[PDB]
Swiss-Prot record:
Function: Cytoplasmic dynein acts as a motor for the intracellular retrograde motility of vesicles and organelles along microtubules. Dynein has ATPase activity; the force-producing power stroke is thought to occur on release of ADP. Required to maintain uniform nuclear distribution in hyphae. May play an important role in the proper orientation of the mitotic spindle into the budding daughter cell yeast. Probably required for normal progression of the cell cycle.
Biological source species: Saccharomyces cerevisiae (strain ATCC 204508 / S288c)
Residues represented out of the complete protein: 1606 to 1685 of 4092
Protein's recorded name: Dynein heavy chain, cytoplasmic
Subcellular localization: Cytoplasm, Cytoskeleton
Family that this chain belongs to: Belongs to the dynein heavy chain family.
Amino acid sequence: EWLNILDTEIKLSVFTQFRDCLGQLKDGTDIEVVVSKYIFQAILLSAQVMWTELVEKCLQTNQFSKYWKEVDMKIKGLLD
């Protein structure tokens, strides 16, 4: 009984952390601060969803330069 409760609870917790992390990333929040806040899977999925949405709007606007510089800055900050 409690194993079957836990099997659903882990997935619910992962989804909750994912939506909280994506919500934080939305409205403007650097990934560096969020790394120490949520599990790896949640921040990973939130980052990937954001990247898809942002690059889709970049593709419709054809302004890849600004977003590429932003992502490069994110990578340098994460490396630091």
